């Protein structure tokens, strides 16, 4: 009864930046020996779990996220590094008991022109909390009269598209990052790694 990980990594369609899909899975047997022994990733920074010592501890739920960013944004998704995408699309707490994992997929999302559904959140009139998603198409008002239309007066659509073509630099290629989130709730551990 192995835990289903094919739907998270070996998927076909991935989500967007502003709406990161969750993949809560439990009541399984999660073999972690397929993550750290697979030469197909770029970052494997497990924060405070000692990835070698994961096949003995048991947890309760494993939350698997999945979204698409560019090369110069993979290092921004980590505790201790902020920038453009730090408080607009995704913000991680400063405990991160999971393992940030990413790989460069430049053969499925790098067509001529590219898919225009990858919309990163631009300047927002708010802040961001750990594990907080916000799917909103409201035009950003910088302080003037609200347009309440389609770029009426000083309005900007906050879902700026990405330019993904098979001719850009490595720092602008479509990446795919999966960030697991382990936890320990007040319940018997139903998922382990024997």
């Amino acid at each position: 009864n192995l835990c289903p990980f094919g739907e998270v990594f070996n998927a076909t369609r991935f989500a967007s930046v502003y709406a990161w899909n969750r993949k809560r899975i439990s009541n399984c047997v999660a073999d972690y020996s397929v993550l750290y022994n697979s030469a197909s990733f770029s970052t494997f920074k497990c924060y405070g779990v000692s990835p070698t010592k994961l096949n003995d501890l048991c947890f309760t739920n494993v939350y698997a996220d999945s979204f698409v960013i560019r090369g110069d944004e993979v290092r921004q998704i980590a505790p201790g590094q902020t920038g453009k995408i730090a408080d607009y699309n995704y913000k991680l707490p400063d405990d991160f008991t999971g393992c940030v994992i990413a790989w460069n997929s430049n053969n499925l999302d790098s067509k001529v022109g590219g898919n225009y559904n990858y919309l990163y959140r631009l300047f927002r009139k708010s802040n961001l909390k750990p594990f907080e998603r916000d799917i909103s198409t409201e035009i950003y008002q910088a302080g003037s009269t609200p347009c309440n239309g389609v770029e009426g007066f000083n309005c900007y659509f906050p879902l700026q598209s990405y330019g993904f073509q098979p001719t850009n630099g490595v720092g602008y290629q479509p990446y795919r990052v999966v960030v697991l989130s382990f936890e320990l709730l007040h319940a018997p551990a139903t998922v382990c790694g024997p």
Partner: antibody
Amino acid sequence: EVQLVQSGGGLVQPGGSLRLSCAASGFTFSSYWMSWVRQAPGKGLEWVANINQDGGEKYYVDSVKGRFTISRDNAKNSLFLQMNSVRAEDTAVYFCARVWYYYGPRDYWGQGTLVTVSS
Amino acid sequence: IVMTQPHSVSESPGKTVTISCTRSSGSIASNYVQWYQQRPGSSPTTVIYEDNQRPSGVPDRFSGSIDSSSNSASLTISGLKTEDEADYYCQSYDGSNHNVVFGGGTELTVLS
């Protein structure tokens, strides 16, 4: 417990191939990645290659792409690095190291064999 | 892609010595950084891994760090003695071309 022995040290001329061996003893030879690292005399270490759990996926450094081949066999518990087209920059003391996990350190090392191409 | 280190260093016993491992290009927080200690002639051995945990048997006078500011990671060697005068290398898997990059090399010497 873990102990590695190397054999095949000698002296050849540019063009002559060699064979280096590394036999493991004390664990499972089908559960850890293997790698090779040479050390130029007085200089720093140099990565060479890394083999998969069976031998399917292999990656070599661009400096010796093609003229270097790493291989392993679970039925003998011995590592092999057979290469060809040896040139001047292949003068170093090769080692033998196993990998705990791919994105991890090299736990154990070997004694070392001097292989030079002196004229 | 390459890792840079100071050529050598010297200090009197009694305090801590530092060794620089500066990333040339790319992020330094990509994968784990592991240091090695090699006595002249002997076989290299792991002195630290993941920059936080320590291998079993290594003395408690070794606790490195990672500075995510300028892509660097220094080693903190406390309790400097004459029995630690050797070479120290850093190592960190970095790059999408599946290549391991070792360190430059640092010849740590003591006041003798």
